[PDB]
Amino acid sequence: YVQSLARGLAVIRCFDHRNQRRTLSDVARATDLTRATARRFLLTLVELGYVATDGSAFWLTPRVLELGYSYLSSLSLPEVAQPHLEKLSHKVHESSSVSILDGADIVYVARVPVSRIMTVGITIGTRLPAYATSMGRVLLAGLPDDELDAYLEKLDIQRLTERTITARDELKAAILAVRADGICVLDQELEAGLRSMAAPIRGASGLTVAAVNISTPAARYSLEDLHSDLIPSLRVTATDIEQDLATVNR
Amino acid sequence: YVQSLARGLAVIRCFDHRNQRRTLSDVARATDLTRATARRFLLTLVELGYVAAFWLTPRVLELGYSYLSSLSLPEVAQPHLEKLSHKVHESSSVSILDGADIVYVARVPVSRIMTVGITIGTRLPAYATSMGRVLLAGLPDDELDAYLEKLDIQRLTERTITARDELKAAILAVRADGICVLDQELEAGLRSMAAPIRGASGLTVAAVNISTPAARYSLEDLHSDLIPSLRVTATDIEQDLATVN
């Protein structure tokens, strides 16, 4: 663990909107350092061209943008989501995906499969009806009310399994429940023996822009086990993806 | 002088759009470090959240953002660019001058099949961009001449101006007109237009622009529809900048 690297970075990070220029003592204070240790880092950064000074105040220069900015700020939603899906899937040993809404269908945009014989994973670019998927109900809960009502007016609900919700009013209710719970569990309404759970991914304004799921055979978990073992991690993954997406698009 | 600081930053610096993933052997080669030294850096960055093969994480954006945020201009401009791009449905930006380059500090992208996208932190030669010519126009004549003395003009497209006196005359006319329209001198099929943003000094300190495919608008349409909006955006940003300083 190279302390000096950590400290030099903390010095760059101590500049912001409220703190545009800082004195040596103020940089020391902001980074939990002393004047003598802070000075060493500040003078190296000045030498490197990352910091400028007039003798009393220090501030950052545009060279700091050379550290990754022009390509990290261009990451797509799937590229932001991928490492987080990989961590989630590796933690719970189940398929995880991200999708977005396209009219009446969800479209898969990122996924991590598991290596099993019987697997429930769908390839990127596949579409599925929004009404019959956990991600779809999450995305639909994110619509403005007039758009949701329009969607539901236009929808031809098909009986896909013996458990598929069949009434427009019961469907609307399941979608509004998702709005209240922050998650959707879909129990074999798409295919018998298959379960999915999904959570919203929001833009920085709180608008739902994508959904993330875990999908699993009904035989691997009771409904109660999903809540104790999988849904907590799914929530954390959704929030991790949100936070990165916000940083990237800032 | 803290050498391990210098090296740790050289490690971050060696990752780019092409080279987003690198093994520990990849990274040591790249920075002329020992495998052993090249290794302790990676792992401090891993503990610190800046690295996760190895790759930069979005937390690396907090370094650049400390700059951007500690400058008044980028966040002051942002809500005006949002309105500008929403009105004209084209990508808009703000940049400042850094030696011979402009550097992008604020943006709003507009996406379609063929997209004009330049990201924050991108650096481009001032002589070949509409914002660079606006920024060079704002230099005192002696600084302009010194800039031109060091400049090696490249042929970026078949249309790029090739002669220094020609370039200097173009810059002086931008100074007179208060805008620059750069028609396909940086990339074939690409047009942009820029207006200056004046600082506390009454001097140009930054520039704002719109860029768009040449095939979307006639030059006439640019002058009639888009450029009047850009000019009011420039002055809205100058006014907001004055309140904050």
Report how far residue A202's alpha carbon sits from residue A238's, in angstroms, rounded to the nearest whole number. Answer: 9
- Inter-chain contact B67–A61, Cβ cutoff 8 Å? yes
Dihedral sign, Cα of residue A103, residue A243, residue A194, residue A172: negative
The β-bridge relationship of strands B91-98 and B54-55 is unpaired
Nominal resolution (angstroms): 2.1
Read off the amino acid at residue B61: L
- Inter-chain contact B60–A68, Cβ cutoff 8 Å? yes
Q: Which of B13, B41, B58 sits opposite A66 (nearest CB)?
A: B13
- What domains are there in chain B, each with its CATH number? 1-57 (1.10.10.10), 58-245 (3.30.450.40)
Task: Show residues of chain B in contact with A50, CB under 8 Å.
Answer: 9
Read off the amino acid at residue B225: D
> For residue A44, what is the nearest residue in chain B, using CA coordinates?
B1
Report how far residue B47's alpha carbon sits from residue A2's, in angstroms, rounded to the nearest whole number. Answer: 10
Q: Are B212 and B183 a contacting pair, CB within 8 Å? A: no
- Inter-chain contact B5–A67, Cβ cutoff 8 Å? no
**Residue appearing with tokens 């009904």:** A218
Q: Which of A17, A65, A72 sits opposite B56 (nearest CB)?
A: A72
Q: At B108, which helix (H) or strand (E)?
A: strand B101-108
For chain A, what is the largest distance between any 2 Cα atoms, rounded to a whole number of angstroms? 76
Q: At A23, which helix (H) or strand (E)?
A: strand A22-23
CB hemisphere CA count around B217 (13 angstroms): 23
> For residue A50, what is the nearest residue in chain B, using CA coordinates?
B67
Report how far residue A109's alpha carbon sits from residue B236's, in angstroms, rounded to the nearest whole number. Answer: 39
| Residue B46 distance to chain A (closest CA, Å) | 10
Residue A107: strand pairing partners: A100, A127
| Residue A60 distance to chain B (closest CA, Å) | 6
Q: Which of B242, B229, B238, B236 is nearest to B92 (CA)?
A: B229
State the burial class of residue B40 (Cβ atoms within 10 Å of its Cβ: 0-12, 13-18, 19+): middle
- Inter-chain contact B63–A6, Cβ cutoff 8 Å? no
State the burial class of residue A147 (Cβ atoms within 10 Å of its Cβ: 0-12, 13-18, 19+): exposed
- Inter-chain contact B64–A59, Cβ cutoff 8 Å? no
Task: Show residues of chain B in contact with A21, CB under 8 Å.
Answer: 70
Mutate to test the interface with A, among B44, B67, B95, B116 (most CBs of A within 10 A): B67
Q: Are B110 and B176 a contacting pair, CB within 8 Å? A: no
- Inter-chain contact B61–A4, Cβ cutoff 8 Å? no
Report how far residue B85's alpha carbon sits from residue B90's, in angstroms, rounded to the nearest whole number. Answer: 5
Task: Show residues of chain B in contact with A65, CB under 8 Å.
Answer: 64, 67-68, 103, 105, 120-121
- Inter-chain contact B9–A14, Cβ cutoff 8 Å? no
Mutate to test the interface with A, among B13, B46, B66 (most CBs of A within 10 A): B66
Report how far residue A191's alpha carbon sits from residue A188's, in angstroms, rounded to the nearest whole number. Answer: 5
> For residue A81, what is the nearest residue in chain B, using CA coordinates?
B58
> For residue A10, what is the nearest residue in chain B, using CA coordinates?
B63
CA A141 to chain centre: 17
Backbone angles phi, psi at A208, to 5 degrees: -65, 120
CA A187 to chain centre: 24
| Residue B193 distance to chain A (closest CA, Å) | 22
Q: Which of A2, A50, A83 sits opposite B44 (nearest CB)?
A: A2
Backbone angles phi, psi at A59, to 5 degrees: -155, 170
Read off the amino acid at residue A154: K
Give the Å distances, CA to CA, from B62 to A7, A65, A214, B68.
Answer: 15, 10, 30, 10
Read off the amino acid at residue B102: I
Q: Tokens in use for A68? A: 């990754």
Q: Return the percent helix, strand and coil in chain A, to nearest 5.
A: 50, 20, 30
Task: Show residues of chain B in contact with A19, CB under 8 Å.
Answer: 70
Cα angle: B233, vertex B102, A12; to 5 degrees: 100
